[PDB]
Design a protein around this nucleic acid. Structure first.
Lengths: 402, 153, 55, 107
RNA sequence: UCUGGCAUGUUGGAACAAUGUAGGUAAGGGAAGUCGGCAAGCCGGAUCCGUAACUUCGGGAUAAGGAUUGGCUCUAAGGG
RNA sequence: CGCAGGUGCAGAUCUUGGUGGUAGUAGCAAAUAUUCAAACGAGAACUUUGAAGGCCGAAGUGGAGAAGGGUUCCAUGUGA
């Protein structure tokens, strides 16, 4: 007979396989549609999730109850050191799909990028690309490279760059760079190839890919949670207290007559570590990263034009379960997938941005920098020293020195 | 007595067997299969590693409920275990075969395990008490083992 | 070796429990030789068997 | 150099973290054995009974956070065992653990 | 806890997943759950007050309701 | 060639015996707890000795009896 009272089904079958992701790095499954009239530009970047904090800003939507009023918004910090271009890939369109036509690599590839080519770098002889690079130097090999760029020019419809992150600059245990193909959009195939060739072996900062207050897409792998029951995996109703043989389960897993368990029934299994793509994340800020100017280190990241505190995006005591952020970073509104240290994929939007929320220009008034290792209450160490006063450890040091 | 197989030439071979050995037949069959065909020094080293859980025996036939371990990829398999008692019993019998080779004048550094087989020995009976006043069998599964080693290099 | 008999014999001779009987760990061989109540008495007088104080 | 004595501070607190109440002191002994094996490469590690008392001094739950031990690599030729070298771990009573470095000991 | 006794109840090692058995805690609501307050929770000792209907005058009665309770230093009274 | 039968099995939840798959699976989860060193020994997580940490907490996991058991008591040796 029919369900007595209607209720919507628990969960979505649009994420059906609900397994561990086969990849640790987020994958761009659709790049923005190419427009030949636009200038040549990149469409994606690779960052690392450092942590979360909250900001203070005043909003500018006229009809709202918070119009011209100060609001507090959670943000996420994604550390994005520059990427190094090491290759070019060409693709041809076929009635069977997009097929890899020819890839060309740069003459010198750093050791951190070569680490991606080995499962045991310690035991390896580091012979990757040692014969390929000699082709860039030999006269016969140079002619083949030029012919291979020409064939890409006259046969390829899609041009991508192979780029890797620099893990020397990150405070992570891992030293192996993440490689990625980033599609080049705009212009003609010839203009794409010329753009790619000239910045081969070069560095692409994140400010040349993304800009301020633009709405981007974040691709990554969700936090892993292991084996879980239907109560946590699919959020089914817990059975009564006096249930025999288990409360945290689905009572009826199917009717008699189809005589099989359907694929649409909640079952216990793997939860988390799922590949996900969230689509509308605004860029609140693009940090500048530490730089040495006139012998003094500039820490001015996360100093707005209303506080001038001379502090860094780093909270007091550092980001928890992540080192110090010393490179360029992207501040996104809200939360993003993954653990800390998780590598995130940031790509340009596939949609046309026309709503007021997406077009509004944001300007931070304050950035929280209190410690996340507890109930922090001091923005800077200088503020804490001024409020607290001299301590016993300072007087002890003075006694030792005098 | 009579072995299952006859050596290619008895002069360059040594035999060793045992009967009614209190080891699990299913565990020993897999261990013997992993040992089969291997050089005597490499088989001795391997069986010691099985005791120390450094190398595993792939459980191919009697594999129901056997766990899955990383060391089983070396055998192109997924299920493997570390049968210590079977490895000790097969180590004792390898030492016996090596001593027989020395007795009849064969060099022990070129000895290959060319034949090894385990057979079910007669079972031994004990009992377990199984609720509602019932008694169920509690049986052991011992085995006979024979091996023939042949000079080969 | 096993000293179960000697811990029982010294317990009855010393009129204490077996938890209060102390056999010298460095004189196991000599204590193991004592299989009579009279040799247990000699070991008590030699100091090889001691009655521990109460807790 | 085979025969060598060194003094260490072992952080029992971070090697016990998360283990159950009935297993904290028993696991702290296995952690000291692991520490001695990694520092001095001998698989034969012997723990002095005074160091066993120090770990159990407050029961099976409240193990001391830090212990100061003395690792001593010596020859096993006295026993003629299959293992050629062994390490003896002894207990060093200290009043404070502040500024205590790993120190070479000679006599 | 002592005298006395024992070795954790026919095995150990590692890990800390789902479901379970046993024990807890939970914001704001406060039985809206359920056949049903089932289960759990509230109360709980002693001292000083104060106790209804009804009644076979015995009870009901620890009815109900309220206050106090630690440590330390003193004081008064109670005997051979 | 004749004579005479306790004369032919796939079944009977058939009778007796033997054997599989299940399956190296379920399981060896009631009463807080073990650790260090040494000895004997071919061999020690489990025996013994010593030192620690714990429990029974006198209506005991203590010391003795009645029924019932019948040599289980004690010493030595073995380890099928």
């Amino acid at each position: 007979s029919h369900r007595k009272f209607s209720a919507p089904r628990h969960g979505s079958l649009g994420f059906l396989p609900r397994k561990r992701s086969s990849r640790h790095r987020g994958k761009v499954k659709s790049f923005p549609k190419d427009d030949a009239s636009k200038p040549v530009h990149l469409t994606a970047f690779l960052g690392y999730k450092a942590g979360m904090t909250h900001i203070v800003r005043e909003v500018d939507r006229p009809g709202s109850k918070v119009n011209k009023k100060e609001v507090v918004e959670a943000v996420t910090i994604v550390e994005t050191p520059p990427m190094v271009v090491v290759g070019i890939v060409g693709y041809v369109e076929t009635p069977r799909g997009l097929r890899t036509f020819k890839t060309v690599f740069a003459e010198h590839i750093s050791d951190e990028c070569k680490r991606r080519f080995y499962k045991n770098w310690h035991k390896s002889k580091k012979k990757a690309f040692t014969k390929y690079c000699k082709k860039w130097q030999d006269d016969t090999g140079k002619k083949q490279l030029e012919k291979d760029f020409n064939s890409m020019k006259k046969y390829c419809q899609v041009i991508r760059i192979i780029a890797h992150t620099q893990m020397r600059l990150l405070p992570l245990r891992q030293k192996k760079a993440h490689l990625m193909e980033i599609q080049v959009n705009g212009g003609t195939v010839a203009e794409k190839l010329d753009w790619a060739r000239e910045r081969l072996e070069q560095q692409v900062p994140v400010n040349q890919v993304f800009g301020q207050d633009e709405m981007i897409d974040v691709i990554g792998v969700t936090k892993g949670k292991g084996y879980k029951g239907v109560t946590s995996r699919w959020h089914t109703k817990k059975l009564p207290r006096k249930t025999h043989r288990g409360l945290r389960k689905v009572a009826c897993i199917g009717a008699w007559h189809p005589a099989r368990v359907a694929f649409s029934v909640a079952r216990a299994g793997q939860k988390g570590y799922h590949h996900r793509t969230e689509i509308n994340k605004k860029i609140y800020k693009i940090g500048q990263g530490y730089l040495i100017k006139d012998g003094k280190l500039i820490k001015n990241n996360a100093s707005t034009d209303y506080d001038l505190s001379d502090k860094s995006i780093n909270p007091l005591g550092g980001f928890v379960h992540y080192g110090e952020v010393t490179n360029d970073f992207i501040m996104l509104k809200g939360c993003v997938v993954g653990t800390k240290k998780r590598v995130l994929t940031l790509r340009k939007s596939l949609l046309v941005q026309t709503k007021r929320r997406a077009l509004e220009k944001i300007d931070l008034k304050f950035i929280d920098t209190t410690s996340k290792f507890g109930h922090g209450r001091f923005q800077t160490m200088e503020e804490k020293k001024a409020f607290m006063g001299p301590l016993k450890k300072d007087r002890i040091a003075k006694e030792e020195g005098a | 007595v009579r072995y299952s197989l006859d050596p290619e030439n008895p002069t360059k071979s040594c035999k060793s067997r045992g009967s009614n050995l209190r080891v699990h037949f299913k565990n020993t069959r897999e261990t013997a299969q992993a040992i089969k065909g291997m050089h005597i020094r490499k088989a001795t080293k391997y069986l010691k590693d099985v005791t120390l859980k450094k190398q595993c025996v792939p459980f191919r036939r009697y594999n129901g409920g056997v766990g899955r371990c990383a060391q089983a990829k070396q055998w192109g398999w997924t299920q493997g275990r570390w049968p210590k008692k079977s490895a000790e019993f097969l180590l004792h019998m390898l030492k016996n075969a090596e001593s027989n080779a020395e007795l009849k004048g064969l060099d022990v550094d070129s000895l290959v395990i060319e034949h090894i087989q385990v057979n079910k020995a007669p079972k031994m009976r004990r009992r377990t008490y199984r609720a509602h006043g019932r008694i169920n069998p509690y049986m052991s599964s011992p085995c006979h083992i024979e091996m023939i080693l042949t000079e080969k290099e | 070796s096993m000293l179960r008999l000697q811990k029982r014999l010294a317990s009855s001779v010393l009129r204490c429990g077996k938890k209060k009987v102390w056999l010298d760990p460095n004189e196991t061989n000599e204590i193991a030789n004592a299989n009579s109540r009279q040799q247990i008495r000699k070991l008590i007088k030699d100091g090889l068997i001691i009655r521990k104080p109460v807790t | 150099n085979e025969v060598v004595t060194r003094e260490y501070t072992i952080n029992i607190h971070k090697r016990i973290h998360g283990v159950g109440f009935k297993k904290r002191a028993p696991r702290a002994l296995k952690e000291i054995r692991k520490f001695a094996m990694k520092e001095m490469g001998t698989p034969d590690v012997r723990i002095d009974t005074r160091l066993n008392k120090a770990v159990w001094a407050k029961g099976i739950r409240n193990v001391p956070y830090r212990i100061r031990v003395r690792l001593s690599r010596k020859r096993n030729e006295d026993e003629d065992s299959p293992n050629k070298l062994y390490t003896l771990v002894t207990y060093v009573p200290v009043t404070t653990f502040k500024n205590l470095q790993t120190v070479n000991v000679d006599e």
